[PDB]
C-alpha cells in the first residue's frame, strides 16, 4: 500500500532495460537531460519529445502551428541547436503546408536510435546513472559469479 508518489521502486532497472522507460519516467528525463546539457546536446531530447506531443494533440489547428514552430526550432538553418542525423534536411517549409503526425513520427524514430547508442548507451555507463545504481544496493562479497547456465 503506497500512497503519494512512486520512486522507492527500482528505477535504474527500468531505464537500463530500455531507454523508453527512462524517457517515459520523470526521474529519467530529469537526469538524462543534465547529462546531455553538459555538452549542450540535450537539444536532441527537446526535439524528440515534441515529435510525440505533436501527434498526441491530435488537433489540426494546434498542429498547424506546432508544425512550423518545431521546424523553425531545429529543422531551420539558423537553428542554434541542430540535432544529429544522417540527412533529415529532406524536409522544407513545404512539410509545414499539411501538418500530420507523420512528418515527425519518422524524424523521431531515427533520433531515438541515435541517442539509444549515442547518449543512452553512455548514460548507463555514466555516473549520473551508476551512482544511483550503486547507492541503491550494496555489493556482494560472495563467490557467486556469472553462472551463465
Domains and CATH numbers, the chain: 1-149 (1.10.167.10)
* CA–CA gap between residue 5 and residue 37 (Å, rounded): 27
Residue 2 grid cell: 503506497
Enumerate residues 6+ apart whose C-beta is below 8 A from 94: none
Gaps after residue numbers in the chain (C–N over 2.5 angstroms):
none
Question: CA nearest 26: which of 14, 17, 38?
Answer: 14
Residue 31 grid cell: 537526469
Distance, CA of 83 to chain centre: 12
* CA–CA gap between residue 141 and residue 61 (Å, rounded): 61
Enumerate residues 6+ apart whose C-beta is below 8 A from 140: none
Enumerate residues 6+ apart whose C-beta is below 8 A from 82: 43, 74
Amino acid at each position: 500500500g503506497s500512497s503519494g508518489s512512486s520512486g522507492s521502486l527500482k528505477s535504474t532497472a527500468k531505464w537500463a532495460a530500455s531507454l523508453e522507460n527512462l524517457l517515459e519516467d520523470p526521474e529519467g528525463v530529469k537526469r538524462f537531460r543534465e547529462f546531455l546539457k553538459k555538452e549542450f546536446s540535450e537539444e536532441n531530447v527537446l526535439f524528440w519529445l515534441a515529435c510525440e506531443d505533436f501527434k498526441k494533440m491530435q488537433d489540426k489547428t494546434q498542429m498547424q502551428e506546432k508544425a512550423k514552430e518545431i521546424y523553425m526550432t531545429f529543422l531551420s538553418s539558423k537553428a542554434s541547436s541542430q540535432v544529429n542525423v544522417e540527412g533529415q534536411s529532406r524536409l522544407n517549409e513545404k512539410i509545414l503546408e499539411e501538418p500530420h503526425p507523420l512528418m515527425f513520427q519518422k524524424l523521431q524514430d531515427q533520433i531515438f536510435n541515435l541517442m539509444k547508442y549515442d547518449s543512452y548507451s553512455r548514460f548507463l555507463k555514466s555516473d549520473l546513472f551508476l551512482k544511483h545504481k550503486r547507492t541503491e544496493e550494496e555489493e556482494e562479497d560472495l563467490p557467486s559469479g556469472p553462472s551463465s547456465g
